Design a protein around this ligand. Structure first.
Ligand code: NAG
Ligand code: NAG
Ligand code: NAG
Ligand code: NAG
Ligand code: NAG
Ligand code: NAG
Ligand code: NAG
Ligand code: NAG
Ligand code: CA
Ligand code: CA
Lengths: 379, 383
């Protein structure tokens, strides 16, 4: 009873240093499962990792074909959206499950059915952001987004001013944070004390610097962050100013089992950035959870074996339709909590969140949120 | 006598008439061949592949095939996610990719082998704005079709921080047939000034629900992002005295353009639009006049580069085309007077950020020109 089952992964290219955090979580999971007797006892997980420049969809395609030709049971495809788009179409045509860990816009007309996404969908996250804004009883707010795509992402937030009694201004960051000051100066001048920053944690770390410099880290302002990697941020410079800072957290650290696995990650890993060294970002804990979730579906389908499919020949995989289905019905308790997909969408629309805020002793849990029972504060 | 072949990827119609874009493509090619003054010694040929527009994989396989037959340009697909993939491929093999439909150009993306003939709404958003301020609106309601319209009209959505304006954002549901619950909220909220961001086909259908709801009156004013406003049947509404305003890129005012539009309404083999569609039969949409203009603009660059010839490139082998970098450049510097007016690309972006517009509004005697707009001198009304 020894069977070789191979996953493919397409990751970011760093010709200048260490492998990315996602590719590391991928390999770390595979190894952890192999060492685990209870999961895939008779089965042994192997893999093939290709590295590409993330916005060359053409390259992401050539490498997705190569892996379908070696034989792969799933492509844990790329992060960037336009490259994940192309690998999604390919995986569909050849009926190999595509596992996505990062959000991208699913065009409506698109009928691809061979995929799932582990990123918390903000059909839900937009509503969690909203539930939070109403709890603080804000009546004016200012949404500051990074790249145009954040409007599609937070569209349920942008529309609320027609239903509820709310008035928001929409501002954008410039390409480089190093002059987000002219903008911050307009918000200051306009007494925009309640703000929602829609950007990556790296951008958030850099914006809070400009904000401090501008005298906007005080008891007057309150900042809400869409980013789930709020704990990734160094908070020493601001916890005494008594700004308010709130965001969500998918990464279930409250559990000791998750904390210990996060520590083995800070291990076997490694300034003015504003980020904490040795921290597992959410994008990485999701990849680790995607390998585990797919594997839970593999343990239920021993009959299944890999197959060498070609992008020119057009012979859909034989166990494709059946595997992709086993996946969508999967249940797993990963680093990021309850995993369950939406049979309809393939998306993750139901999950649990910890709502975290900046007290004087650092970031702290002040409640929970799930789409069913909404916000649930502890006081 | 030299044979130069363009490739085109178009929408699949099993098995009715060929789409309007593919027809404008073939119509242009033929018109140029018959024209002595353009490509006199050169003869244009082509290969048209048909694909399902959201299978980017299929649009890829077919883009490779044409690069292998040998093509000087792929007038790639319309849908965005398929035009994305063909854009990357064209880039890797240095064959110009000609786009005629808007799509979001991700910022990090460095592909340089392409141009887009669709009027960019870094400019169109500003033209919509210039118009809103001329009417001196202080409240407006933007209704968009699919999420992507927010990225498109982002310069409009942000204006409430600069100017004195207050807009509500509403969305249409998948199917127009119940845009009534929404229209009923706008009515109840006295949202008399509205901007509809959707296709003309959706606009035709929404105006029906609006009439039914008693919102086609002298109280309402609707602005349309769509450039195909003249595509709409306007008989049912021109007497109600609603106000209806939008822009028009298609230079019909010119007789030469009108006659070519007439040869197009002719030779058209598509069943008239179903009654109850709300559209006029035999009408050249802007998406089609752009494709006709894209074949002509590229051809103006070909006439300047006789040395150039086609080459059979493979998607596995990786040997960029020999005249690629030089052709793609001749294109970006092109100037053409097409059906849609002044064509000129932005050397920086490859996009069409400078163009001319006719601003058109619904008078009682049908749709009418009431001014112009170009990014330089902004709005320019006649009164
Ligand atoms: C807001 O700021 C003050 C001072 O930092 C703090 O005491 C309060 O608890 C904060 N509010 C929340 C929701 O954390
Ligand atoms: C699946 O997706 C839709 C749209 O996002 C959502 O409304 C629906 O409730 C989801 N289904 C489940 C089972 O959660
Ligand atoms: C909400 O939170 C309270 C206290 O934190 C907890 O006791 C309760 O069970 C939660 N309710 C639900 C159903 O989420
Ligand atoms: C095409 O020839 C027509 C005459 O049919 C002429 O009017 C027009 O200028 C020509 N186009 C070009 C490129 O000169
Ligand atoms: C809007 O008002 C009436 C129709 O109700 C029309 O006569 C008038 O010309 C319109 N205004 C413009 C600028 O189109
Ligand atoms: C197009 O170039 C013009 C100047 O030639 C410039 O104003 C504009 O920024 C360019 N395109 C964009 C959208 O950046
Ligand atoms: C605006 O239009 C008028 C005619 O109505 C014309 O005389 C004038 O030149 C135009 N302005 C410019 C330069 O766009
Ligand atoms: C293997 O992981 C640990 C032991 O290493 C065990 O607690 C866990 O349940 C196993 N994995 C599963 C859930 O099959
Ligand atoms: Ca194992
Ligand atoms: Ca000719």
């Amino acid at each position: 009873t020894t069977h070789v089952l191979r996953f493919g992964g397409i990751f970011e290219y760093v010709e200048s240093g260490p492998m990315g955090a996602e590719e590391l979580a991928f390999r770390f999971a595979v190894n952890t499962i192999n060492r685990n007797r209870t999961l895939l006892p008779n089965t042994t997980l192997t893999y093939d990792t290709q590295k590409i420049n993330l916005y060359d969809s053409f390259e992401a395609s050539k490498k997705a074909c190569d892996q379908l030709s070696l034989g792969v049971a799933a492509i844990f495809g790329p992060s960037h959206s336009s490259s994940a788009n192309a690998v999604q179409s390919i995986c569909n045509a050849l009926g190999v499950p595509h596992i996505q860990t990062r959000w991208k816009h699913q065009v409506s007309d698109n009928k691809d059915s061979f995929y799932v996404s582990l990123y918390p969908d903000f059909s839900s996250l937009s509503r969690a952001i909203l539930d939070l804004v109403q709890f603080f009883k804000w009546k004016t707010v200012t949404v500051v987004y990074d790249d145009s795509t954040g409007l599609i992402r937070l569209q349920e937030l942008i529309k609320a001013p027609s239903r509820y009694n709310l008035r928001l201004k929409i501002r954008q960051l410039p390409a480089d944070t190093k002059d987000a000051k002219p903008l911050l100066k307009e918000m200051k001048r306009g007494k925009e004390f309640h703000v929602i920053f829609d950007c990556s944690h790296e951008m958030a770390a850099g914006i809070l610097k400009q904000a401090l410099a501008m005298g906007m880290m005080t008891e007057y302002y309150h900042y809400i962050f869409t980013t789930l990697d709020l704990f990734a941020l160094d908070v020493e410079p601001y916890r005494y100013s008594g700004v308010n800072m709130t965001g969500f957290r998918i990464l279930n650290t409250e559990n000791t089992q998750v904390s210990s696995i996060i520590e083995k990650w800070s291990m076997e890993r490694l300034p003015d950035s504003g980020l904490l060294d040795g921290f597992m970002t959410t994008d990485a804990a999701l990849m680790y959870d995607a390998v585990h979730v797919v594997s839970v579906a593999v343990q239920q389908f021993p009959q299944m074996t890999v197959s060498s499919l070609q992008c020119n020949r057009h012979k859909p995989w034989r166990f494709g339709t059946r595997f992709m289905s086993l996946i969508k019905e999967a249940h797993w308790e990963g680093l990021t909590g309850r995993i369950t997909f939406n049979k309809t969408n393939g998306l993750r629309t139901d999950f649990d969140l910890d709502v975290i805020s900046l007290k004087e002793e650092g970031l702290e849990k002040i409640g929970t949120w799930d789409p069913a029972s909404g916000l649930n504060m502890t006081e």
